[PDB]
Amino acid sequence: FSKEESREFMAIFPDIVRDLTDAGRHTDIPEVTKRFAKVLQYNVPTGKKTRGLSTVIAYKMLEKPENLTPENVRLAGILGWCVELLQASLLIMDDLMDRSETRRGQPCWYRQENVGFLAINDCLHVESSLYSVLRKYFSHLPCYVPIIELFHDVNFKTNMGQSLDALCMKDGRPILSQFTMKRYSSIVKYKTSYYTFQLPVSLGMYLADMYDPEQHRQAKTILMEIGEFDQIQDDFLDAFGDSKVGTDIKEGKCSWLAVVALQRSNPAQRQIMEEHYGRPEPESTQIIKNLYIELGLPATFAVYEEESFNIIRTHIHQISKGLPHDLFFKIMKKIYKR
Amino acid sequence: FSKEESREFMAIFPDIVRDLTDTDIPEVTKRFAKVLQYNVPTGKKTRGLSTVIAYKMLEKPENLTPENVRLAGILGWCVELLQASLLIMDDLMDRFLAINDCLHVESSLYSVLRKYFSHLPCYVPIIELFHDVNFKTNMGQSLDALCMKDGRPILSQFTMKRYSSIVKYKTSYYTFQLPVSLGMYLADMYDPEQHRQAKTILMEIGEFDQIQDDFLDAFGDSVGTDIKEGKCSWLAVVALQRSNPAQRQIMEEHYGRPEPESTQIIKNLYIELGLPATFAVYEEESFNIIRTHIHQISKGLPHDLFFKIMKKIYK
Ligand SMILES: CC(C)=CCC/C(C)=C/COP(=O)(O)OP(=O)(O)O
Ligand SMILES: [Mg+2]
Ligand SMILES: [Mg+2]
Ligand SMILES: [Mg+2]
Ligand SMILES: [Mg+2]
Ligand SMILES: [Mg+2]
């Protein structure tokens, strides 16, 4: 993203914290409002903010140029921060569920002194807070109700994704019979692609007064295809990228690598996965990495990266109902880095 | 609640489960049906039935159609979905329930609202009420947690002002305000002054409800764990107001400890400090104040609704 777009977006965050903690609403409980400021300051504004900024980009590529006022671009930024509020809520909870040590370079929120399982309340609180932001800045606009309904629906779908991911684990141990490409695809769609890709684009559309369910559906078909590649590349680089140190094997994740390894494995190779996948010992991670190398997963990913890129590019050329192709090409180029 | 009211309310629940669960992801949808079935419809449903009663006592008789009473029942089930999300979060904090099931069950009430209410004039006030009540409930949960540090109760925090705030935010908003404000909105009663007048009485009733509960935790016939858990209970707050330095040291030493003998030491102190007699004086004085405020209720609100709520809490 541009320096001007990044700085404009970052300037909004302190106002959202004031709106949620210092707007003279709850003056009888200052210790709680001061704490919630710290919850927001720790968990919301330190990332790359890809999803927030992408909300602004989407809006700027969907709206008529003559409607792109500083005021409307700031509303897009506020919607972006609501996506970053939802994400913060989801990751606070996922870290507690996964018992992770760090997120985005920082100790996980639940590990901070006197949090622990109180992170569940903080998760609910941060997600609830975005609706207060929506009421303040959007209650007077026609997009208000569609935007509220989109956030609640995406929250419900993301929960289905997280729960489906959990149905791949039994008492801390991966259930390898569950590691199918069909279930993988479903996990990625529900758990990540709705909030990562569909939510920013649909928000841009609503702010631009695009309400045609068919325009949203066309955008969704493409964004779910891009989202699937984004998570597959992420899974690949967890094991094969250059040092973030990847822990997906130890964690027993239903990764694209594990799914494709099980498709390709002879019985001896399947037994290695059963014995060593999702185990804590370093030598068990190395055994799984070595099996991924033996099964040719690097070549497999290289072929998938080229084929998927060509299929998505073809599908974007075929988009209709006046959706701008350049937006979908721009999202592709960010994800494929070409 | 009449047999007819209870039975009509219960008949809605299977529809709500089908609405939310019945797809490319049938194994996780089936699981979510079980999450709902196992956690939402069991036990008394006082908050959801209160929403129906509020609507029936607020609406014009001519508008009380079977169809509108069913809409009130659906709003009551939305309150019960929020209750279930809060009981799940409590079960998770105590401990096939998954940690995200509390978030998922809470999110599901907004899908029910969209389904049944999105075309009605009351829709935005209702969704905004749920949004605000959720935020306030979370603030109250956080304030309760600020009364504990490193596993020990912070007795300097145990003030009546903080106790009243905890009860208001954590409990009374969603238990008492939300059912009545829903009944009002469904009956096209939008006037902020009417909601405010109801709120004054409902927060007083909610305060007595929690104080009675706190009293019975220690003094009721069973099994109460407030003392062992170091809870910011009315008994602990008043004990600290009434204690001399020797009595305060007994609280510092024994409040919030795991040993059964420490719970008996604290119960003995509550007896020594006359907490039972203090509760008797409060129950009589609060009953009189609340009855007075109900008789004074204005802005065209019905007395009988608030008397009914008061009578269920005080018996
Ligand atoms: C309803 C909830 C709480 C959803 C969580 C959403 C999410 C993006 C989880 C992280 O995935 P992960 O655990 O597979 O990977 P990591 O934690 O390593 O990012
Ligand atoms: Mg996870
Ligand atoms: Mg995780
Ligand atoms: Mg990853
Ligand atoms: Mg990780
Ligand atoms: Mg109790």
Numbering used by the authors:
A (entry chain A): 86 to 328, 333 to 427
B (entry chain B): 86 to 107, 112 to 184, 202 to 328, 334 to 426
Paper quotes:
Isoprenyl diphosphate synthase in P. cochleariae (PcIDS1, EC 2.5.1.1) produces FPP in the presence of Mg2+, but preferably forms GPP when exposed to the heavy metal ions (HMIs) Co2+ or Mn2+. Inter- and intramolecular cooperative effects in the homodimer strongly depend on the provided metal ions and regulate the biosynthetic flux of terpene precursors to either biological defence or physiological development. Strikingly, a unique chain length determination domain adapts to form geranyl or farnesyl pyrophosphate by altering enzyme symmetry and ligand affinity between both subunits.
Stabilized by cation–π interactions with R427, the F315 side chain positions IPPHAl for nucleophilic attack. V286 and I420 form the bottom of this specificity pocket and act as a molecular ruler, whereas F282 and F315 engage in π-stacking with both allyl groups.
